[PDB]
Symmetry: C2
Subunit: 962 residues, 2 copies
């Protein structure tokens, strides 16, 4: 069911057959200093470490910082021959395909894919902005959003890393931001727009107010347009020309462009001096740690079998199926918190949603920022207990027998299980290293494993050649077409990363219909952040909508950027645009604490290499570091895993055993461990000049749309002693009935005397309590009269405390405010009669029971609503009178609502939803917290009908920490 | 540090050398039905099963209960030869001692320790109550307690169901119970007491209400006095005489006593016919599933080495030391919930404490009421992350190498740890089986392992012989002497178990100064439940106090009754009287989920045998149960462990393999597992007639209480719009200051004009909010006026919602209500000045930051309290610019600080109370001025030291209700 696409092949430039072992560090520096390819590789990747090695080979590098130079150069040597991961001059990227026969020779030719350093370039533009503000034009930053009397940003940039800044919302800010919304405006024009409405005596205030907006990036200049996204040398230069009077930047910049173009055509290794020039010009313009990005691409075309294509598709099936056991996630708990605050009939503006005071904050696992209210970790189920038992069992088995762990043992388990079988998972990208064992070619999953972000790995390389652009577009096309059918608008989120040294990773080509910019600007169609609303669909899944066009959105970060470094809102928009199930393989979660893990395999694929944990506390004194790793049986060759980089180490190499001793005592300082993996021969499969290359691959594998805008607090919240009085009476479940029987009647009478009405509700959340809501002329007079009764209920220990709370009306849920009022009329009339049914159920001398009264009043409800019908009643019933008493009141109120519903052409769908509620809140009053027995009373009721058929220039700037 | 006492020896009566193998079940049933000793053993231990076996080999047993009868009888056969655990006619108890040499021959003679069946006896006595009421006298059940308009019992018994029952609190119940509260009262006199203030026309109602009180066990009769606890045949018999005119009960009971007394002198095996008499006699009186308890005791005297005394004491040190790593428990979390509700200056009545509506519920782990409000599992540290890493490491090491796990690897670690602390742990009882491996004598800990309950194992056997009574009293003597030193009054909790079929286990003989009775009564001095109040030490530790005598109490259940089957309140009283640390060995917790655990060892003691988990789900096709236990390398002999019973099995025995196959498919359908353990040869160490006995042993090893009774809800809670108006204003932390700057002043001005006062406070949990408290004449006018300001703060999105809540005054913390009022005056004056300090800090032109203003106000508070006397101020501190002093509201503050100080001096507050109050008052100023993240606060004290150093009719109702538990 998973179909493997053509794939990226990444392989190293040097060949590991030319690697040589070293025994002395000084010895390394010389072989390296005579290695032409290596020296250019280092000058490009890491200019500052490069200059330090020059300072070495010219006598005076201060001899305290010599070892660090050593350790670094050795690791860079290792990284240059081993380790296939794409990065400037070290290794190259190419397209692979499937055919009827394998092909591993690289016949094609190598290109340089050159980019400015994004951190350099951004720093430059900010230099120019400060110089030429009055000659530029500025637009509004989409990151801005008004909240109350303040103007926030989703995140802050110009900071020195600690502070988040917000300003006050003033007339001046309004004029300026409205004037620059979806528009650029020369500095001068902005200034006048405010003076043409304030006076010319205020020109000076304007110039600095505007000055402040540009400094704290509430306004971005025309220079930042397409700077990151679809950068052009020519449009960049044109823009700079017009503003650069003294030719201070334009002349040096063209030399840089010229040299880069010259550098482009040079071979790899015989280009060090041309590169030296390139830094020199750029260094003079502005120093940065790095100046140039390079992505090596290539003409080659590696081929895989048909046995290989199935083998990979088999693995994609298996990995996908394990998700079937993800029952409950952090987003699910988030979804639940959403449903309790907002109804199920509300779309909420996303900045409001994520506010921890006016909304509900973020998911438990989110960190930017983490919630500041207290919360305990939500229950999450990522695999079943039965499954966890099998996994631990397979583990102790494999350890005891000194064997591999065979994951395929559970393949049937995952395929035969489907339950609700929707196939939520839409596609994968796996990351596989190529290697050998016992002279046989094998796949090895990286620690990376992969993810469900199609296009993720290719997005960076897409713009480097039309064959790549074509490749990207095809991978992306799966999701894009499935979006076309469901009439969903896609958006790339395009942003200036908070941490500016992460800028080079943001990069990708926009393949989506629109764009969400942050601290930047593009030519694509852009969504405003404050137009984004979040709702929940009929099957209870999050969705985003642009309220201004009513379109539905899915958002994309089509890159290898860490998806957890985003502000909460951005992370959310991403995550609801995928399936929430891939990410937590069971074996990773279950085996993580063990200090030895067997190799994990699946159908001859190595799922994970064997892993070791080595602890500081174990090197002892009569137990050497070498003797220790032999005691735990680490092989001659192995990796140490720092993060997402591993370094090759050999037990037989003296330098390497040093590296190990260094690593083990830095973790020692921290009461920590160090991670080892076993090694695979990975040097002789992909070849070029009859020499092997280290290689990895990345294989991609492939209705009531209503919903009301959330109504404002001012219209929806009914404050104490306005129209309503709302009390939370804390009463234990065992005693609520007695309160309703023997206390409520008195209360109802008091409120009757004042010609008002009341309805109540039963709740469990916080602690058990009854929610009283009273509508009446003199509310405070009513409170005082109630209070005596409450005092008695406290005295008898029926009720502990109470609160007087704001009544938050469920407007959206019950139609308009109009339909709401009549619903409330039903609530009261229903409340009015409940003590009577309860008296009645309680009575022994005859009848009834509870569940009879339940079934009977739902029926009375349905008859009333649908006018003694049955075809109307049954069609409603398939998705889910005679006694006088006070039912005259209830029937009457049900009547008025049915009439007003019909009077305003409520759709059938709206009417059912509203009706279900009225029945639901009745069930709440009559009997307790009811769950799915709601649908059983509905299920039971089918049968019965079946059988019948001036200082606003202030900018009060504030900063917070973290 | 642990010194081993004389120990209990428990050994089997039969000898395992005379055990025999069987091949088919019918072969067992026949061998058994002609085995003299087994039949008397069976007739005593399990009467209904005996009759099922009789019904079987006489044709009459329905052929579905045949399999059950078969397995059951096999296991009881195994259990009579194997299994040293003490229990009627199967095995016997004796005292063991240490000397200079081992001695394993049992020389003594075996005696019967016979007791009636407690379920039999109590059920009988309950009938007599219903029959002979008017001829009896009654006392109040201590389990009773008033709460509001109801009368509950901490648990219910007359439940022959799963229901808990409570009645209405009526004037009649009050009269009857206060009358019967401290002693017994003739049926007649209770009745008069009711009619003498209701009328003689109510006599008929009195008789009925009183009855229903007895029916539902709200009252105990004089029959129950010492019934369970210190039962005497004659004091019991005499009482029955006085009420039984028709001699319907007395004549058979005397027969029962005579038959039992005759049974006593009979040997083991030769009594089947005498027992049958006892059953027939007692069954005619009252049928029950069991009739007779027997605890076999013996004068024998097994001896252990001096190497053995070290070996055990070494093990006790090690086990005890591991508790050193228990940092935080479920009781530690509860202690914290206590302090959040009540603070530290309150003693709370235990029934209120445990109420989930009016109190704080129970500890997280309690289940007799598990809490009904939602709660997430508390953080607990029973071992460190480093320790856990070590155990896992040792686990993977041992499995990979097919070795034992040597707990010795960490003896050095636990021993050298935390030498500066005294260990709360005052003693252990360890439970050890005796066995061999490679012909060498070894100790093996039970899975039970043991506990920190001294006297637990001996309490049951205590009354059976003067040598036993002496032995028990000696173990208990440690605890009891130390209780005397600390001036602590001890209580045994004496109770009829909720599950009336557990009746026989409650039994222990009373060694403590008082007794806390439930559904029974004794002759000792008794504590009332509703007199027990709970407080906290200066050292943050729970204690119990009898409010009527001001005594401090520690509580004891000196038996083997499962300490988790108690009502919460009872469980709590038990557990706070011990260390909260022993019970969770780290390896037990950490290895718990592995479906193979290696043998755990320590100094030649086997701490735990190797354990296996075998699953139903794994017997499918080509995989037979025998093939399965072979693949997991189950040894030839092994135990299957159901619960507190293990059954012996051998792979070479066909029947044993049948038992197993049955065990696994009963687990299959429920999709769970079965537990196996390795076997140790254990039959020929302790001997009698030159034949071995299966044996285990159980070895025991060895200030200002102020605090106010909690002020009542009615007296402490100030309802909305009476004297006070209280708003919870929900405002984010980042913007609270701003609110205090540009909104509170307007509010303060509103309430000012109405001639009242307000004080505020910052809180963080639930969600951040400011607690506003206003005192004023016309509160509802003040609300409406304020309300506009608040709506303006909503608009600006500074405040989201607010609540109007009940103000729970902190009386105890701030002295009486008198000193409270005066503190409140300070709270308000202090609140008045915070907007200026905040402006003054917000002002750039100052150069006064937050921490400068802080110390200056902290300094000024102290100059006030101790009237500029720098030397007193320093003494206070040693247990832990001008524009402000001239500021109009700081003068108000100074006055208020003075007025409190006067009343404090006037009421002879102990010096420490005063220090404490000041500290609180200073703490809440800090709260108002700056946030609430703390202890960088007591840093304010340290620096402030520097500044002062450097200045040198229908209420007969019984409205009975039932709940569903």
């Amino acid at each position: 069911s998973f179909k493997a696409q053509p794939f990226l092949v990444r392989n190293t430039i040097l060949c590991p057959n030319d690697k040589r072992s070293f025994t002395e560090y000084t010895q390394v520096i010389e072989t390296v200093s005579k290695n032409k390819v290596f020296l250019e590789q280092l000058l490009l990747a890491n200019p500052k470490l490069y200059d330090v090695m020059q300072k070495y080979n010219a006598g005076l590098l201060k001899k305290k910082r010599v070892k660090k130079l050593f350790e670094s150069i050795y690791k860079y040597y290792k990284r240059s021959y081993l380790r296939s991961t794409p990065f400037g001059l070290f290794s190259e990227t190419s397209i692979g395909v499937f055919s009827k026969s394998s092909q591993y020779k690289l016949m094609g030719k190598t290109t340089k894919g050159i980019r400015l350093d994004t951190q350099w370039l951004i720093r430059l533009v900010h230099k120019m902005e400060v110089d030429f503000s009055k000659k530029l034009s500025f637009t509004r930053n989409n990151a801005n959003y008004k909240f109350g009397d303040r103007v926030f940003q989703v995140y802050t940039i110009n900071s020195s890393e600690l502070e988040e800044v917000n300003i006050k919302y003033t007339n001046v800010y309004q004029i300026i931001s409205e004037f620059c919304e979806n528009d650029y405006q020369k500095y001068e024009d902005i200034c006048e727009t405010v003076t043409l409405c304030y006076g010319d005596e205020y020109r000076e205030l304007s110039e600095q107010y505007l000055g402040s907006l540009i400094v704290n990036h509430y306004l971005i200049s025309n220079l930042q347009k397409d700077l990151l996204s679809d950068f052009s040398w020519n449009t960049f230069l044109t823009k700079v020309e017009a503003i650069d009077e003294d030719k201070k930047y334009i002349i040096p910049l063209k030399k840089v462009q010229k040299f880069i173009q010259e550098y482009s055509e040079i071979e790899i290794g015989e280009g060090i001096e041309k590169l030296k020039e390139i830094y020199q010009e750029m260094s003079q313009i502005l120093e940065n740690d790095n100046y140039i990005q390079i992505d090596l691409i290539s003409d080659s075309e590696i081929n895989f079998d048909v046995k290989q294509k199935q083998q990979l598709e088999h693995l994609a099936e298996f990995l996908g199926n394990t998700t079937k056991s993800v029952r409950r996630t952090y987003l699910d708990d988030y979804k639940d918190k959403f449903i309790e605050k907002y109804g199920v009939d509300q779309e909420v503006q996303i900045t409001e949603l994520f506010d921890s005071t006016f909304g509900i904050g973020a998911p438990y696992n989110y960190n930017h920022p983490r919630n500041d209210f207290y919360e305990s970790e939500p229950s999450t189920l990522y695999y079943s207990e039965e499954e966890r038992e099998k996994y631990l069992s397979m583990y102790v088995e494999a350890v005891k027998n000194h064997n591999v762990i065979n994951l395929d043992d559970l393949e049937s388990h995952y395929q035969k299980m489907d339950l609700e079988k929707k196939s939520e998972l839409q596609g994968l990208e796996l990351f596989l290293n190529l290697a050998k064992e016992y002279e046989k070619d094998i796949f090895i999953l990286g620690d990376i494993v992969g993810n469900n972000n199609l296009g993720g790995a290719s997005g960076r390389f897409s713009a480097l050649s039309p064959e790549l652009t074509s490749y990207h577009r095809t991978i992306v096309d799966s999701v894009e077409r499935e979006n076309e059918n469901k009439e969903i608008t896609s958006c790339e989120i395009v942003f200036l990363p908070e941490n500016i040294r992460h800028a080079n990773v943001m990069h990708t080509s926009i393949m989506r219909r629109k764009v969400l910019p942050f601290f930047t600007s593009t030519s694509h169609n852009e969504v405003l952040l404050t137009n984004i609303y979040i709702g929940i669909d009929e099957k209870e899944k999050f969705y985003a909508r642009d309220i201004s066009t009513q379109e539905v959105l899915k958002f994309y970060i089509t890159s290898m950027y860490n998806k957890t470094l985003f502000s909460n809102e951005l992370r959310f928009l991403y995550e609801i645009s995928l399936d929430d199930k891939f990410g937590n393989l069971p074996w990773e979660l279950i085996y993580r604490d063990f200090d030895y893990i067997p190799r994990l395999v699946f159908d001859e694929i190595v799922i994970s290499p064997a892993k070791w944990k080595i602890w500081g506390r174990d090197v002892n004194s009569k137990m050497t570091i070498r003797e220790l790793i032999q005691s735990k049986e680490i092989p001659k060759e192995f990796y140490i895993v720092n993060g997402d980089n591993k370094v090759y180490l050999s037990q037989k190499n003296p330098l390497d055993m040093e590296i190990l001793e260094s690593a083990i005592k830095k973790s020692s300082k921290r009461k920590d461990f160090i991670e080892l993996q076993e090694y695979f021969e990975d040097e002789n499969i992909i070849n070029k000049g009859e020499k092997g290359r280290v290689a990895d691959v990345v294989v991609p594998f492939i209705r009531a749309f209503i919903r009301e805008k959330r109504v404002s607090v001012e219209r929806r919240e009914k404050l104490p002693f306005n129209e309503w009085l709302y009390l939370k009476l804390y009463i234990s479940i065992n005693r609520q009935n007695e309160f309703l029987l023997s206390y409520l009647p008195d209360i109802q009478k008091i409120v009757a005397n004042l010609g008002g009405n009341l309805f109540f509700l039963r709740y469990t959340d916080p602690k058990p309590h009854i929610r009283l809501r009273i509508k009446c002329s003199d509310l405070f007079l009513a409170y005082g009269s109630i209070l005596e009764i409450l005092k008695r209920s406290r005295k008898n220990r029926i009720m502990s405390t109470f609160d007087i709370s704001i009544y938050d009306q469920e407007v959206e849920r019950y139609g308009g405010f109009d339909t709401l009022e009549l619903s409330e009329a039903i609530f009261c009339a229903d409340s009015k009669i409940i003590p009577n049914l309860l008296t009645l159920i309680k009575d022994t001398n005859n009848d009834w029971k509870v569940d009879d009264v339940s079934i009977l009043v739902n029926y009375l409800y349905l008859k009333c609503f649908f006018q003694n019908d049955n075809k109307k009643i049954l069609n409603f019933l398939n998705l889910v009178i005679f006694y006088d008493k006070n039912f005259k009141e209830l029937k009457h109120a049900i009547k008025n609502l049915f009439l007003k519903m019909i009077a305003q052409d409520f759709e059938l769908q709206k009417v059912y939803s509203i009706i279900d509620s009225i029945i639901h809140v009745h069930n709440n009053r009559l009997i307790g917290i009811e769950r799915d027995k709601e649908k059983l009373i509905y299920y039971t009721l089918q049968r019965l009908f079946v059988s019948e058929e001036t200082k606003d220039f202030n900018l009060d700037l504030v900063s917070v920490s973290k």
